[PDB]
Design a protein around this ligand. Structure first.
Ligand SMILES: Cc1ncc(COP(=O)(O)O)c(CN[C@@H](CC(=O)O)C(=O)O)c1O
Ligand SMILES: Cc1ncc(COP(=O)(O)O)c(CN[C@@H](CC(=O)O)C(=O)O)c1O
Lengths: 382, 382
């Protein structure tokens, strides 16, 4: 007979894309609308990357690549994790995927069985629960508080661990909070994975957008249980290039590669050779990370001063380019707050799907002029 | 707690990997061996397509695209399916995917519920059975015969249908047979679909590499039951660009896009604009296609005369760029034959995984000088 599978029918939308869409329906239809949505840098990919791409095009590098990625990228990846993150990884333990999104999707398919519990910390990125449910697993949430700086307490994590616990997902720097978890917390969370035998999944894609504090990889402390997910998307503004990477135990990496062969075969060969340039032309890429980071700090400090002056509450971020704002003064519910803000002229993402109620997500990957218009209209809706 | 998923533990090992671990150790030896194992054109991506990618870079089209593909590509796709295939689809009934591979994966993931049966025709492309068993479905293989020219008998297909049949996959021009299905046969298969109510999955990625016959799309006959898969891979020598596309009922096409967001998000943006060039610039593309098709023709006949001349049987191909040669004179089986050929300095793919037993797959997408060099070496083992 005909009809769609249950697994695809049970899946809910994503406001993180349903808002950016809508904004354009209305903005392509006119209307001065300031957007504070968006999960990508306003910057365009560094020029040294664009040329590495053109060189590949000219060298005729347009052929099929191995499901785990070109050998050269896999070697530059091991070197990246080793020097930047201090992870003892060989090239066999690295994999190139179609964005970090696919590094998370292929992992869940190669590790989850129906009924397997996955602990996700709220607020969390919209896709985590969806990627878990699609694979057959069940989502176990463990809340982190605004008054804790949105930093999880391993005690509370420990209390969620049942015998069905297959994986734990940690993401630092975090979306949507903007929190940077300290070495001790990530280290405590890894100990728990080693003691209660489960996988620790670490999404570190915002690694280089760090203002204060330092980035730590829990993989140092638990290499046989940790799968470190990352990608070129946030760091070098290559969102549309679809290039992510992950490292972990040889058996899980090889299982993730099998799924790839089955699905995408392997990531676009041009984008791979271009990413090799971002990882191996250190002095030109660093100047890129430095430029963007100072421009994001400036954007953050300016947003925060204006929020505080308007009487709005928001926990100060240390990474990423997101801000969770308590919509308490605007409306009795984040969904209603967004409605009122949209009328007022500003697009923003409701925190309902992030299991961040009474909150909204503002992104500062836009110019300081737009941030001012938004602080202007926020003062209008009051 | 830890360990891989049931679906990954249950994947069947590859036999082509056993031979294509033995080749590379003759290669690492330094042994000069030509390879008729090519699953991709030998021609590079035409300059107009390359220019387009260079322009998209310069235009700074390096950001997120819709999960279903850029609006501009779905419009052209709608146009390509109508003008080139007789399929009356709308841009809403089209989808851009990371290769033709992903169009097929997302599909089985959007229609198969555990236990659902999918009828496959053998010899079959290695990945079909694997993608069906990954969504919990079961493979029901029906055999197409050499004595019958690898064209499916609708009656033999009608007998395998049960109340649990959800899909049927036809592939014409075929991999690995090269056969092209006559309009009459394709209509009979699309009558079964409509009659017993089930999806018909038609893989047409080898559409323009046809040397004799006429390419018919059964979707033209059973529009509500057919999902048509295609790609830029073979036609425009764009295998490493990773672009594919499909068309079918809006219900399935919408579910497939749901599976994309939660996994790959959307295919590379640069590679999407290049495809828009290959598809809209009809004058330049038509020229690459006809020039290449004529190259394949000459190379095919070059091969076919030699085998007959050597007494090696192979059912003459009318599409794609593959040949199935009966390996009885070489050795007791496909695998033993292939290893025996490796020692004579040729590298071929065993039909084992294709469920083309006793046969070996040759690929004529390589120079004519290598075709003559392979031909001489065969003779040596005969
Ligand atoms: C926390 C987190 N992890 C992974 C990704 C996926 O990145 P790639 O697939 O692009 O490499 C993201 C990405 N993106 C934005 C926009 C979106 O909805 O994808 C966001 O989360 O707002 C994030 O954060
Ligand atoms: C019949 C058939 N359908 C789909 C594909 C895959 O297409 P793309 O991902 O390239 O667009 C194939 C393709 N290709 C080769 C090599 C491979 O592993 O992708 C093959 O089948 O041997 C075929 O035949």
């Amino acid at each position: 007979m005909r009809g769609l599978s249950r697994r695809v029918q049970a899946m809910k939308p994503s406001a993180t894309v349903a808002v950016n869409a809508k904004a354009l329906e209305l903005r392509r239809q006119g209307v001065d609308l300031v957007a504070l949505t968006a999960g990508e840098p306003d910057f365009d990919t560094p020029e040294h990357v664009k040329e590495a791409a053109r060189r590949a095009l000219a060298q005729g590098k347009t052929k099929y690549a191995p499901p785990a990625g070109i050998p050269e990228l896999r070697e530059a990846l091991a070197e990246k994790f080793r020097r930047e993150n201090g992870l003892s990884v060989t090239p066999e333990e690295t994999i190139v995927t179609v964005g970090g999104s696919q590094a998370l999707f292929n992992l869940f398919q190669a590790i989850l069985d129906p009924g397997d519990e996955v602990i996700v910390l709220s607020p969390y990125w919209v896709s985590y629960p969806e990627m878990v449910r699609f694979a057959g697993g069940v989502v176990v949430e463990v809340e982190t508080l605004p008054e804790e700086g949105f930093v999880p307490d391993p005690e509370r994590v420990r209390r969620a661990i049942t015998p069905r616990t297959k994986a734990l997902v940690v993401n630092s720097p975090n979306n949507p909070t903007g929190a940077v978890y300290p070495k001790e917390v990530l280290e405590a969370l890894a100990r728990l994975a080693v003691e209660h035998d489960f996988y620790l999944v670490s999404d570190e894609i915002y690694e280089h957008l760090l203002y204060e504090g330092e980035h730590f990889s829990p993989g140092r402390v638990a290499p046989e249980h940790t799968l470190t997910v990352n990608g070129a998307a946030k760091a070098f503004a290559m969102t549309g290039w679809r290039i992510g990477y992950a490292c972990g135990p040889k058996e899980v990496i090889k299982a993730m590669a099998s799924v790839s062969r089955q699905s995408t075969t392997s990531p676009d060969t041009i984008a791979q050779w271009a990413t090799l340039e971002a990882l191996t032309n250190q002095e030109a890429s660093r100047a890129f990370v430095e430029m963007a980071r100072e421009a994001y700090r400036r954007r953050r400090d300016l947003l925060l001063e204006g929020l505080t002056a308007l009487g709005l509450k928001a926990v100060r971020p240390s990474g990423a380019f997101y801000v969770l704002m308590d919509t308490s003064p605007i409306a009795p519910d984040e969904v209603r707050a967004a409605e009122r803000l949209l009328e007022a002229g500003v697009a923003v993402v409701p925190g309902t799907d992030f299991a961040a109620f009474g909150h909204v997500r503002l992104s500062y990957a836009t110019s300081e002029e737009n941030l001012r218009k938004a602080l202007e209209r926020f003062a209008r809706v009051l």
